[PDB]
Amino acid sequence: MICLGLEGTAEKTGVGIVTSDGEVLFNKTIMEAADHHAETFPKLIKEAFEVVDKNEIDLIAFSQGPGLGPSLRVTATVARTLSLTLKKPIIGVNHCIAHIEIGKLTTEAEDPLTLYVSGGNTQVIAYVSKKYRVFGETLDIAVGNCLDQFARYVNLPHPGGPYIEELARKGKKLVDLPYTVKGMDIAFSGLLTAAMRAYDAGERLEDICYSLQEYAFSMLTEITERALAHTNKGEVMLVGGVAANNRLREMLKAMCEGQNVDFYVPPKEFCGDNGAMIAWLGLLMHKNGRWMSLDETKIIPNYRTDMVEVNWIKEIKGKKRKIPEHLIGKGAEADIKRDSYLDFDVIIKERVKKGYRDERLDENIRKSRTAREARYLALVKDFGIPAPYIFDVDLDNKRIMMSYINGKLAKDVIEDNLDIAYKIGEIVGKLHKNDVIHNDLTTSNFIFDKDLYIIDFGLGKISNLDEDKAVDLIVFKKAVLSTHHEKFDEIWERFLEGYKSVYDRWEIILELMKDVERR
Numbered sequence: 001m002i003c004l005g006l007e008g009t010a011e012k013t014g015v016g017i018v019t020s021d022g023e024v025l026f027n028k029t030i031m032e033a034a035d036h037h038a039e040t041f042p043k044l045i046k047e048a049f050e051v052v053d054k055n056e057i058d059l060i061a062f063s064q065g066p067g068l069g070p071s072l073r074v075t076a077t078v079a080r081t082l083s084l085t086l087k088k089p090i091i092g093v094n095h096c097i098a099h100i101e102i103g104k105l106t107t108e109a110e111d112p113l114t115l116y117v118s119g120g121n122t123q124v125i126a127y128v129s130k131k132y133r134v135f136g137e138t139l140d141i142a143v144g145n146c147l148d149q150f151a152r153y154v155n156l157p158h159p160g161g162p163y164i165e166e167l168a169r170k171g172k173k174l175v176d177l178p179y180t181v182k183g184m185d186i187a188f189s190g191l192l193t194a195a196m197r198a199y200d201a202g203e204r205l206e207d208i209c210y211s212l213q214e215y216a217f218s219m220l221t222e223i224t225e226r227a228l229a230h231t232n233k234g235e236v237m238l239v240g241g242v243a244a245n246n247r248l249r250e251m252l253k254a255m256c257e258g259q260n261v262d263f264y265v266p267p268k269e270f271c272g273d274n275g276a277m278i279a280w281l282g283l284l285m286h287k288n289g290r291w292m293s294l295d296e297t298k299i300i301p302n303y304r305t306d307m308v309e310v311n312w313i314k315e316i317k318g319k320k321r322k323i324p325e326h327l328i329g330k331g332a333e334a335d336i337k338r339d340s341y342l343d344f345d346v347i348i349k350e351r352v353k354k355g356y357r358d359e360r361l362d363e364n365i366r367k368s369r370t371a372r373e374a375r376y377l378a379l380v381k382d383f384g385i386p387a388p389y390i391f392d393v394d395l396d397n398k399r400i401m402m403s404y405i406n407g408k409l410a411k412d413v414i415e416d417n418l419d420i421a422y423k424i425g426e427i428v429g430k431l432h433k434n435d436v437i438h439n440d441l442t443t444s445n446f447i448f449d450k451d452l453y454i455i456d457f458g459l460g461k462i463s464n465l466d467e468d469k470a471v472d473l474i475v476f477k478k479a480v481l482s483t484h485h486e487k488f489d490e491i492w493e494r495f496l497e498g499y500k501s502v503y504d505r506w507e508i509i510l511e512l513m514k515d516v517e518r519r
């Protein structure tokens, strides 16, 4: 069995041929643009057909999604046509899984937590409980896009990636940009606009680039690291056109090294768009029992990775991590000592260095995060929300001395006692009622003594936009799903009631919530 693949979901259009052996017999790729696809698709198909012959192809596979609406219609048309013009089977393929899969083949990684970054995508995905599941992602635009968009504005040539990274190697000043991480996801729009205005403010180009890099990349690495720990994967992989970046690679390895997990990037040929990744995943799904009707290859630009029935893995899942008990923070945000002060049981909380990041950024990140945590932990007392008392804060050392709350954290009780989901609701409501935003709502954030306390506020912002309050709930929703999956519908339908009894504007934000969960 041997297959031909057609790739063209945006700018590039590529085609390739792979054996069942995993041998790339041919793979080529040249750079609306949907016209530019049908323009050169047949040019490539010819060139392929020189090196391998038409009548020995057994499958056609094509990139079914996710992707750019119009330009997907074209690629599908080309492949739909050519399948019949050979009287041979055709199957549709998930773009993202193809990336992760051709990685597996050409790095001898066997099962990674993979970061997929490019112009149109920014996802961390891992094969967990039978399906290819998404862990953290961009809430607005892909790093690839954020970069290009900045490149154009600053008038650099377009595929903006390489140029920003060049100029970045000359950069001395680390300029102030937002670091926005919302739970397990990230946003870029801010970062982007804030680079734009800094350019405007006459910061020097080299400095802006360096900083837009360090920022963006750091975000991705935190988002990746976080995700890693909701896994026992022993290996991280990095796929997509943005993987070309040496500095991103650089960061990631450091994070990886410092978490005892080996790190993979696949060869240029299979790193960005290409027909050969499409050929393989087709060949892989088909080899093991998937056939597809001509009616079943309808285009879907929204294609999640869970939408696909993984039937090509059955083997030993490679190299895994061991998850011990109360065992120390190897790559943890905080170091927590227990202590006494004025005969009060007390916590000293320190935000340690993160070895992968640039020290300047690191010093700012842990500096900002502790201050904010002191700011809001105290502030939030004015709204009747039980919280530890801030006894002392220390910005040169990133230390906070605060009250010790004896009890169990929501996570360990919430399932059996549902009232505990309600009390979370009420706090969030009270936060939202006061235009205060937690950016990391989770059941490990709250401790229950006689009442329920927030114990973390490291990423709080004051904002009064309904949008921010809706994504607040969306981070918590995902948290509840990822850690209390089986008892979700209960916990969520109860949490809402706690938020109901407390915020009047609840519908306007719950309605806006159901809006974002579709964009």
Ligand SMILES: Nc1ncnc2c1ncn2[C@@H]1O[C@H](COP(=O)(O)OP(=O)(O)NP(=O)(O)O)[C@@H](O)[C@H]1O
Residues within 6 Å of the ligand: 010, 011, 012, 095, 117, 118, 119, 120, 121, 143, 144, 145, 147, 148, 159, 160, 161, 162, 165, 240, 241, 242, 243, 244, 245, 246, 271, 272, 273
């Ligand atoms: N050295 C680099 N540093 C940073 N970004 C880069 C670099 N080289 C390329 N890129 C970015 O990578 C993106 C192109 O990769 P590519 O995978 O072709 O994107 P795509 O068209 O969205 N395909 P896909 O990855 O399948 O979604 C562009 O947005 C580039 O700006």
